[PDB]
Subunit: 217 residues, 6 copies
């Protein structure tokens, strides 16, 4: 990554073994549960494109997902190039060249180039632009791999309301409803069991989740 | 987080993998036992709003609680805005803008903005203001998820007084009696078993817990 | 804690995850065995009052003990205030105020105040004063939770002398005899089994523990 | 490795125990699965030739592979020497000598020499040149140890399409098809089971993997 | 401990959790096997007397040994005082006082005093003087707790010579023969089994251990 | 060890707990498999003689080997003294004395002396000279403890060629053939099973290992 040292300058630091292992193990344990995305983002704090590729490339399973992610990346890289075309032919000697989509994705740019963009004044934050693309991809995968429709999360007749709500919002998070506060006074009540539904209906509209959860305790 | 380096300046540091993992595992092991709150506070030492959101967002279960927490956050953000409205329209070029509730919660502010507030002279401690909101939320959840009323913590006929007292104060902590020294010379004696109650009554009022615990040994 | 950096100034550092976890796990594994106290002291090296409270507050069990400890703290805080009363009414603008008992215990003082006391010239070592109070409390708990009287530690007829001595001094440590060198040429011999007692009596007085242990091998 | 310190100069740092252990354990757990290569590259960030040899030499099993890797190294070293022959006889006193193939591979050069090349202006990046050779070798091994031909990865009649695709791209990665986006609209469909193949044929050409995977859900 | 920082000055650093845990666990796993002593010495690198006491005091078992160690310490402290008596009565204001035995053992000296001695020019290395005393004590314990006389380490009729030699030198190390090279051409041969003894006798005198071990393979 | 800090000067640093534990555990897990030697070398990066002795002395088993290693050390120390005799009698006040064999092995020199040699201009690299001696010793032990002659590594009739080759080069590494590329087109083919031998003979001479391994797949 690029870090500030103990004296203020932005400099390159090797990716730690700790970071490398943390990311690999989160994917091993959680696959594409939605909580993997914020973890990915945090573990990739300060990352260069190189570092991003390293993290992705260290994943051994899930190669259908990694291939889908390459595809998303390629789509975002092609839109980058449409928005910001680069002058072809030879670069002014010693000068910074402008990044293309593939340079941002770290496939046709060197670490040194990446460091130059990222630390230039003003900076071209290639690592953050690429991260956004990867996260866009990752979110598609989380949605695709969501195993259950929100329509099938219904409270069991003996199921504690809290366990139902946990299932419902974990499902909603994966399906990626933006709806989130919203769905509360509608689908969540509809999919509640008969006894709880009666209670919740009686509360009247505008009930907070806390209120709903106390009511159905 | 924002830290002081080895030379005195306040600067941004990536959240560690160690920190990230510690928080995720505490929630996995302890759920919303009350001791999770001081741990959260300590693990979030120096946090920006971004860092706070990261920590929250890395939690995979308990999505009923995380949704209740968003709600509390939204309530505190709306009261922030009532207390400190911000001039609308365009900001003076290059100048610091004033934070709104959603900026404090990290949803409409950038890391750079956050860093500027937090390190400005005088500082606007957005990370500490947000932390207070999250802790307010978290405390509601701890109370809600407390499984037993203090009224049901009564000493077993064969139950060591110390184990009873441990149960009683662990329950009181979750229910969040402010009462804490208080409840000592009342409910704790009332809920003691017949033999211990007799002993404790004989001690007279004003007995310290230590005295009570020795007496009922 | 407050640490010296790599350039000589005293500055605040966040409590580490490593420290936090170490303390929680020692309490989980060892409860109030006497060796927990020196560990607590060492893990709290450089601690502010805030840090002390964090460590205490992260303990999830043993709430009878934590309540007894609050009580001891309150007693020491009240004696602090008797010894060092503070001028009431408004503080000189910008100046350091004097700490009261509750400020030392971190309940009515801010981190910033604490840092100011601890790094002032001359310093008011609030973290060390509070630590002393907590250790006084903790020692009471270790004594209370000692499961066996020294009077009941007697050598088994088939019990190796070394295992007996280990039991005897582990018990004495918990009961907190100051006696420690002392009890050696008396109770330790008295509570030895018949064969070893005969041997030890023959050695004559003034025998070192090493001498006793060789003799009864 | 060679790192930049907290003040800007490039200096030698001992390889960490953490790094050493991470590499040894990845090889123990994953052998020559293709994801070991990006891990190797990342763990060897900043490595000198010495460090590269250390990492390789710490591997205890797989000595057929390590011998094949020496062979590849020797081939690349011999081509280095063909491209960049070095003046024989005695070196100018105090001056940097030019590296030969074996110097780049760390077998006839000292750490000090290596440090001098790597930090000279302009640098001779011996550690990166050697790393490229090792990775060339390693890729040959990954291909050789790939257990299954892509021709034998065919979807089971009851096999979820996603699990098939995972098998297919994991196999392709090992066999090292450059084809990767390519093989998607051909072999992947051909090797799909009858029901999925029918669905995929109906989609028409140009289907993205995401589209294919949704279709065969 | 007292360390040199990244700028050359000697300063106090808190004992790490890592160090604390390492020492406690070595004692738990190995008790007073002789290899614990060099580990103790290395873990206590740079230690103040305070730090030494911390490490000792964190040990929960083995209290017979810890008491024997206090005794040794007291003996060395009393000889210190015989060799280096200190002027009684009040110290020159602001000046360094001279350490007594108990100051060196950290029982009547403050951390600040200890730091002053250790970093004075010229230094009074109180931490190293105390460490020597503790190691003297520890060595007595290792010898006392050695379970087997060297006289009882004899090669089994089916026992590989190498396993015998391992037993013999592990025993000798505990009993603390200075003899070590020595005992090689005598007791080690005497205690060898009949077939190996014959072989070894034939080698003639002056055989190296390597030679002996090859011979009896 | 002696390290360069964050400002360029060579200074002493305590051996880490991490390093100490890593070395002890490698010996526990792998004994004297040949891969222990490069690990030892890497873990001892920057070591003083003191540090080298620490690492060796922390090993609890294998005392036959540790004794053989002392012997090798003594032999190298005696040859050092033959090559570089030192002027006897008193040293010039304040000046660096010249190291003898035993000073290099850390038995008659202080840490301070060692630091002075190692950081003098020009340096006397006592830690690297001693390391070379220890590695010479260690290599003798690896060879001695090799359990199988290369002559007995022959491919099983049902044994995959790759597993045979792994056995053969792991054995050769321990026996310490310099032969290594060499033995490839001879003994390795000779010790192959009948079917593979026929295949390999047909390839003709000059086959690379890769070629051999593909052929016998
Ligand atoms: O090097 C890698 N490995 C990647 C993985 Br694994 C998943 C996603 C993108 C990756 N990239 C960059 C890249 C390559 C080819 C097409 C597009 C993006
Ligand atoms: O980004 C996140 N994730 C959060 C979680 Br998980 C729980 C609480 C608040 C969170 N925030 C900020 C936020 C979002 C939306 C409404 C209010 C607060
Ligand atoms: O915040 C905390 N948590 C504590 C725990 Br847990 C045990 C002892 C004291 C504690 N304190 C300070 C404090 C509070 C109230 C009365 C006195 C002392
Ligand atoms: O020292 C080592 N150990 C190595 C391992 Br293990 C595998 C590959 C190369 C290695 N090298 C460098 C080297 C030696 C001899 C021929 C060519 C390359
Ligand atoms: O504070 C401690 N704990 C010790 C342990 Br545990 C063993 C040895 C000495 C120790 N010391 C110093 C000390 C105390 C009293 C007599 C002599 C030495
Ligand atoms: O202090 C130690 N412990 C050692 C171990 Br354990 C093995 C090898 C040498 C060692 N040394 C140095 C040394 C001592 C005596 C003879 C020669 C070498």
């Amino acid at each position: 990554p690029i870090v500030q040292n103990l004296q203020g300058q932005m400099v390159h630091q090797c990716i730690s073994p700790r970071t490398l292992n943390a990311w690999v193990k989160v994917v091993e344990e959680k696959a594409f549960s939605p909580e993997v995305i914020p973890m990915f983002s945090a573990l990739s704090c300060g990352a260069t494109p190189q570092d991003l590729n390293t993290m992705l490339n260290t994943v051994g399973g899930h190669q259908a997902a990694m291939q889908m992610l390459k595809e998303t990346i390629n789509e975002e890289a092609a839109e980058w190039d449409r928005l910001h075309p680069v002058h072809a032919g030879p670069i002014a000697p010693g000068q910074m060249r402008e990044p293309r989509g593939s340079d941002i994705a770290g496939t046709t740019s060197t670490l040194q180039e990446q460091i130059g963009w990222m630390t230039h004044n003003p900076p071209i934050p290639v690592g953050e632009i690429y991260k956004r693309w990867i996260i866009l991809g990752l979110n598609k995968i989380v949605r695709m791999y969501s195993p259950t429709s929100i329509l099938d999360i219904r409270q069991g007749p003996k199921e504690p309301f809290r366990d139902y709500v946990d299932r419902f919002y974990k499902t909603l998070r994966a399906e990626q409803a933006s709806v989130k506060n919203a769905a509360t006074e509608t689908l969540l009540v509809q999919n509640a069991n008969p006894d709880c539904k009666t209670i919740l209906k009686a509360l009247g509209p505008g009930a907070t989740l806390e209120e709903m959860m106390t009511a159905c305790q």
